[PDB]
Amino acid sequence: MRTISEDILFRLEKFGGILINKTNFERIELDETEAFFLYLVQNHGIEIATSFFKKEIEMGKLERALSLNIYSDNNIEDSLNNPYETLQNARKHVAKLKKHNILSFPLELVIYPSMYCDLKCGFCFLANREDRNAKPAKDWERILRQAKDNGVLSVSILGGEPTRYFDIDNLLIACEELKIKTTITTNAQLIKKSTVEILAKSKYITPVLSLQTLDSKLNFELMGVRPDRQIKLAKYFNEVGKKCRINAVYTKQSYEQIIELVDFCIENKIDRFSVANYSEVTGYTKIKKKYDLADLRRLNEYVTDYITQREANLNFATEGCHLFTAYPELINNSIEFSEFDEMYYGCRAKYTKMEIMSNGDILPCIAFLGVNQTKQNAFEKDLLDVWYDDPLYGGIRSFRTKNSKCLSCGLLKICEGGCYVNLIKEKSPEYFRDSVCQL
Amino acid sequence: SKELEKVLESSAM
Ligand SMILES: C[S@@+](CC[C@H](N)C(=O)[O-])C[C@H]1O[C@@H](n2cnc3c(N)ncnc32)[C@H](O)[C@@H]1O
Ligand code: MET
Ligand code: SF4
Ligand code: SF4
Ligand code: SF4
Numbered sequence: 064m065r066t067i068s069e070d071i072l073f074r075l076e077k078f079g080g081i082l083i084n085k086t087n088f089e090r091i092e093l094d095e096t097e098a099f100f101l102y103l104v105q106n107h108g109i110e111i112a113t114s115f116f117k118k119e120i121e122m123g124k125l126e127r128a129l130s131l132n133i134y135s136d137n138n139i140e141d142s143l144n145n146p147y148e149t150l151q152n153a154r155k156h157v158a159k160l161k162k163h164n165i166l167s168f169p170l171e172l173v174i175y176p177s178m179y180c181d182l183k184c185g186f187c188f189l190a191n192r193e194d195r196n197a198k199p200a201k202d203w204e205r206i207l208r209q210a211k212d213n214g215v216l217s218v219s220i221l222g223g224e225p226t227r228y229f230d231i232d233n234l235l236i237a238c239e240e241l242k243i244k245t246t247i248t249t250n251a252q253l254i255k256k257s258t259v260e261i262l263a264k265s266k267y268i269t270p271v272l273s274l275q276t277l278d279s280k281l282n283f284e285l286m287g288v289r290p291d292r293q294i295k296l297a298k299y300f301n302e303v304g305k306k307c308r309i310n311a312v313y314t315k316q317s318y319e320q321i322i323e324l325v326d327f328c329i330e331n332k333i334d335r336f337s338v339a340n341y342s343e344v345t346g347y348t349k350i351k352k353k354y355d356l357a358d359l360r361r362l363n364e365y366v367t368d369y370i371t372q373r374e375a376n377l378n379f380a381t382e383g384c385h386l387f388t389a390y391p392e393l394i395n396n397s398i399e400f401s402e403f404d405e406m407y408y409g410c411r412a413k414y415t416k417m418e419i420m421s422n423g424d425i426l427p428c429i430a431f432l433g434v435n436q437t438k439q440n441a442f443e444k445d446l447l448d449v450w451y452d453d454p455l456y457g458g459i460r461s462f463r464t465k466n467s468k469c470l471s472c473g474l475l476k477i478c479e480g481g482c483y484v485n486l487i488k489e490k491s492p493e494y495f496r497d498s499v500c501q502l
Numbered sequence: 503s504k505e506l507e508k509v510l511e512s513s514a515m
Contacts, residue, residue: 342515382513383515386509387513408513456512
C-alpha cells in the first residue's frame, strides 16, 4: 500500500481535486489540502506525502483521505522531481484551470479506429460507413497513453464496426495492458474468435452488443440482420462468466418487444441493458424518429414497474441528451450544483467528453460530424493542447442562451437552451429553444 | 436529489 490504485482515478481540479472509483464511477470532491496530498502520493508515494503534510495530518485534515481504500502497490516509477517542485507544479496547474475555467481533461474518450461497417442500419448517425485510411493500433496507442496520463476515466471503442477494424486485437490488448477501463460496442455479426477470446479473459474491457429486439423480422428491418448472432454471443459470455451488456436504440419497438429483451437480459445475466434515445443530431439518420424524450421516460416507467412487479433484477437504463427535460417535477430554481457537477451534468461535450474519428479529427461530440468547421488532428497534436485551445470546444463552452424561459430555468447552467449543435443550425441560436426540450 | 441525480447521469449519449 504505497501508491494510488490503478482502479482509482485521481485528478487535480480548479477547486482542488476529484476522486473516481472506476468500478462504479462514484465521485469524491476534494479540497486543495486533500488534493495536493494525494498528488504527492501519486508522484512520490505515501511515505514522502505523509512526511510532507505531517502538520495537516496532526490537525486531522487528512483523516478521510488516509482512510479511503484507494492505495496499492504499483510498478510505476515515481517522479524524478523534488516533492517541492511537484507541489509547485500543482499550484500552477490549479491556477491554470481557474483561468481557463475548465475540467482538467475529458473523463470520456470515444475513439473510432475505422468508420467502415459491414452493416447499414437505418438509424445509424454516420453519413457513410467506408474507410480506407484507418491507422494501425500503434498510432492509437499513443492516443491512449496521453489519455491515461492526463486522467481519462474510460475509453469507448466505436466506429464503424470495431470488430471489422483490421488491428482491433492489438488495440484491445493495448487497453488491457494500460489498465484502462474500456468498452467496445459491436453488432457481433463477424467478430473474430481471437477477439472474443481476448474479451472473455479481459479484466478491463466490457463488450456491448447492439441489439434492437428479439423479433427477427423487426431487427432485420432496423439493422439488416437477424438477432441470432447477438443472442448467441450474449449466451456465450454468460457461460464463461464474462460481463456483457446490450444497447438498443428506441426507434419503433413496442413495449412488448422491449419486455422480451428485458426477460432475455435477465435470464442470460446481462450486466446492463440500455435503451438509447434516437438522436438525429448529426443530420445523417434516415429512419423517421417516432418517439421523443418524453416517450423515453414513459418507457422507463413501464419497464421499471415490470421489473419491480415481476420481482426481477436488472441494471436497466434509458439514456439521451436532455432527458431531464422530461422530468419537470424534479426541476426548480432551488437546485444547486457543486463546482464539478455544474460542468459535468448536461452537455458532456463541454467539459467531460472527447471523440476522435478514424482520420484523427478531434470532436467535442459526434454531433460535430455535421458541422462544417476545421478539426484538429490527434495523430499530429497533443490531446491536452487541443483540450485547452480548440475553437470548437471554446464555442460550445462559452455559448449562452438569451431565451427568456431558459434564463429562468433551474437547469440553465447545464443546458443553455438545449443542444448547442442543434441551436447553431437555427436562424437565431441564442433565442431558439431546442425542440427536444419537453418543458 | 437522488432522483434528480440519476436522471442527470442518464442525460447523455
Ligand atoms: C452512442 S454509443 C454508446 C451507447 C450507450 N451510451 C452505451 O452505453 O452503450 C454506441 C451505440 O450507438 C447506437 N446508435 C447508432 N446510431 C444511433 C443514433 N442515431 N442514435 C442513437 N444511438 C445510435 C449504436 O447502435 C450503438 O449501440
Ligand atoms: C455507430 S455504431 C458503432 C459500434 C458498432 N458498429 C455497433 O453498432 O454496435
Ligand atoms: S452496426 Fe453501428 S456503425 Fe454499423 S450501421 Fe449499424 S449503427 Fe452504424
Ligand atoms: S432547453 Fe431551456 S427550459 Fe429546457 S431544460 Fe434547457 S434551459 Fe431549461
Ligand atoms: S453537443 Fe448536443 S449531442 Fe453532443 S453531448 Fe452536447 S447536447 Fe449532447
